[PDB]
Amino acid sequence: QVLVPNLNPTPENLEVVGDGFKITSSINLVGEEEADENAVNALREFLTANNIEINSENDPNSTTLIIGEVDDDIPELDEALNGTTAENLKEEGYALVSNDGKIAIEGKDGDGTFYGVQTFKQLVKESNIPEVNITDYPTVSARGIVEGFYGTPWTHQDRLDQIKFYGENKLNTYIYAPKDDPYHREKWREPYPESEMQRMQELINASAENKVDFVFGISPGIDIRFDGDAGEEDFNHLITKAESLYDMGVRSFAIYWDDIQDKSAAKHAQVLNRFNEEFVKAKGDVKPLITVPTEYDTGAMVSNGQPRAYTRIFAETVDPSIEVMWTGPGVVTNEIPLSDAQLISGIYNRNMAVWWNYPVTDYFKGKLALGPMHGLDKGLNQYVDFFTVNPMEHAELSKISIHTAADYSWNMDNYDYDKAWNRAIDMLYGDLAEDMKVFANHSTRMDNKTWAKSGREDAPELRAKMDELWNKLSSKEDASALIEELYGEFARMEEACNNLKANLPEVALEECSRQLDELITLAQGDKASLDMIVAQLNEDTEAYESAKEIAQNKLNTALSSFAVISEKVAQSFIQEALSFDLTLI
Numbered sequence: 001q002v003l004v005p006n007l008n009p010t011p012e013n014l015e016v017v018g019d020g021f022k023i024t025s026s027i028n029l030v031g032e033e034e035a036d037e038n039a040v041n042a043l044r045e046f047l048t049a050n051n052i053e054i055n056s057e058n059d060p061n062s063t064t065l066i067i068g069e070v071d072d073d074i075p076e077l078d079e080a081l082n083g084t085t086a087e088n089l090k091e092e093g094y095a096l097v098s099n100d101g102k103i104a105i106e107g108k109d110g111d112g113t114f115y116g117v118q119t120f121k122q123l124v125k126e127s128n129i130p131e132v133n134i135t136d137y138p139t140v141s142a143r144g145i146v147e148g149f150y151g152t153p154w155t156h157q158d159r160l161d162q163i164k165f166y167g168e169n170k171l172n173t174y175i176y177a178p179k180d181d182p183y184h185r186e187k188w189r190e191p192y193p194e195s196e197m198q199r200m201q202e203l204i205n206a207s208a209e210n211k212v213d214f215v216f217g218i219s220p221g222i223d224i225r226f227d228g229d230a231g232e233e234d235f236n237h238l239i240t241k242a243e244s245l246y247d248m249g250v251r252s253f254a255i256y257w258d259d260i261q262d263k264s265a266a267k268h269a270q271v272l273n274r275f276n277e278e279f280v281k282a283k284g285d286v287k288p289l290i291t292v293p294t295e296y297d298t299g300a301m302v303s304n305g306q307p308r309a310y311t312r313i314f315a316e317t318v319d320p321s322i323e324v325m326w327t328g329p330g331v332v333t334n335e336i337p338l339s340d341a342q343l344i345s346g347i348y349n350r351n352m353a354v355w356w357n358y359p360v361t362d363y364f365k366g367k368l369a370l371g372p373m374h375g376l377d378k379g380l381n382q383y384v385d386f387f388t389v390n391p392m393e394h395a396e397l398s399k400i401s402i403h404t405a406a407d408y409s410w411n412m413d414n415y416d417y418d419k420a421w422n423r424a425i426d427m428l429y430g431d432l433a434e435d436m437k438v439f440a441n442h443s444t445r446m447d448n449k450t451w452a453k454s455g456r457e458d459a460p461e462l463r464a465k466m467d468e469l470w471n472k473l474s475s476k477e478d479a480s481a482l483i484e485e486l487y488g489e490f491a492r493m494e495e496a497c498n499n500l501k502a503n504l505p506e507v508a509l510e511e512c513s514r515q516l517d518e519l520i521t522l523a524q525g526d527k528a529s530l531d532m533i534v535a536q537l538n539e540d541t542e543a544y545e546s547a548k549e550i551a552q553n554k555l556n557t558a559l560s561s562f563a564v565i566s567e568k569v570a571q572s573f574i575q576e577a578l579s580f581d582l583t584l585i
């Protein structure tokens, strides 16, 4: 339409060049047989879904859609593009032009054509398409998800849905590494049963269809042996287990050393160099080997600007072709400043991979991590060419944070976490988006009270309003308009939560029903907290006492519950109100 819809990720260069036009009921398609197979299917599926027919002939002044790669000799495309091209973009880059009853998609390579089609899909709203000239390409070459958490692994259905979801948002990496799949870690030696294999084949296939590298991770750390013939048999077990997966089409692999006791850096890396030599190089079509060392956060890797002993030997031993992940300054931390990547990258003498622990909640499962990528430097691409997030065991609600990770890593320099976060929920939740924002807003900051802290603060604007209320009140100023405003906010929280319980799809609701009820409880305690303030100002001892018992119950209910939400806002406000003695004349 006239207006450009929400797009994700944010295209590098987009310009509106006209008024927009309505695509016709059937269209002329050019380039099908010569253009990327996966791109065309995704194009077909979108056409089928939106009841847009294809002409088996051509003209009747129907909309023309031209699709192809720069390398193809396609004149209609050249003409339809009219000077703009993907010729000089990086891999996965594309050019899209919609003008005057024509849409032209040109990829730099097949991946770029597929991605062009995803942008086309996001651009079309009720047959209306804006008129734009786009050139697009990612900041970072590897973008995706590592299923690396503890707890119930994603179901097969979950994974397939996730893969399609990655393709649509232009993420190209899925690392299969769940800690509590025994065939990955606890029984890392034994092959998959001849039906978990069938499920593997589907994962592999779906990833191919969506331009996602399926990375198979193995974590031998617990009981692997290195010395003598034990070490040899155990090494062989890696190869046979990897080949078993290569044989069905796995062309990316990871060997992980995270959270084991064994700190033998030379042993770990020689296993990696052995595998890199006798497996990766020998096969010729396997991507760079990926790893994570026993020391994987800056606190664990570094001492006063220098590598620790393990890190030193690992860095100096591991092959330059091997991609090394780290998590940042801590395992779950506020930030990765440019200076942290510079440091670690300097130690390994290369571009690093990030294993980012958000939205993962395995260490603190009562809270859902529902905020955007936050704290990650917008120039990280200077030292990082591989960005993954470790998600929650809750596949569906992970989409929100994943959605924003896709924008951060594709278009890093323009990344706006607030805008990305709003876009994620808008694009995911539709009619329910405004209610979903109210609830998810209260559930962004992860904090286990000890080693793990990350994410945008919960409900900052509400927090600022609460702060404003206390200083108006402790200054003896009129806070009545603010009090009234805060009543509106607490009522609004409870009503959003109720609309969500009533209207969310079950697949999302089964993941958040407890945290929903908890924000309701909290909102009701916040309401009772204002009642306390008002009764005090009014010198009504009775109304105060009654409100205090309610507020105190709601807080106690919240504190005892499994579910955790809004600790520093909705919850703490009640503690603040209980402790504020407004009657001291």
Ligand SMILES: CC(=O)N[C@H]1/C(=N/OC(=O)Nc2ccccc2)O[C@H](CO)[C@@H](O)[C@@H]1O
Binding pocket: 148, 149, 150, 179, 258, 259, 292, 296, 327, 331, 332, 355, 357, 360, 362, 363, 390
């Ligand atoms: C590379 C990485 O972060 N590995 C694991 C990881 N490892 O950190 C720890 O092992 N932390 C820890 C160790 C002992 C006791 C308590 C926490 O942290 C993530 C967040 O929970 C897990 O999901 C990851 O699988």
